[PDB]
Amino acid sequence: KPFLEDSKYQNLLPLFVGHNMLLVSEEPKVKEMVRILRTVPFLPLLGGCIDDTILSRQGFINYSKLPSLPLVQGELVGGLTCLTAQTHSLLQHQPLQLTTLLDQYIREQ
């Protein structure tokens, strides 16, 4: 109680009532944790924090599906430039559309 009163984590004081244990690691193997939890139905998860971000079980289940960080960082730029790419594609497809229709006419003949 005394630590949770004055720390980075303060909102877990209601969580920490009664008997409780903590899963601690250096790697965010959330999938493995939830996987071994599904084995025993009665056992509940109250949540906590992963990667210094406070969240419960309902958030942890959807988080369990996550690829490598650098490619998501690149996908951020990809999504930002998605609008520009869409404009370029909408501008460039119509000449390509005519060329592909001519090719399809060739194939039909």
Binding site: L83, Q86, T87, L90, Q94
Partner: peptide, 29 residues
């Protein structure tokens, strides 16, 4: 119009403005 003027207008317009432009283009084309 002008080629470079349209490019500057797209850059000045916001992101949700661009999405509206693409949607209208498909209906016209």
């Amino acid at each position: 119009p002008k080629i470079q003027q349209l490019v500057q207008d797209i850059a000045s317009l916001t992101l949700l403005e661009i999405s509206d432009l693409n949607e209208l283009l498909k209906k016209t084309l």
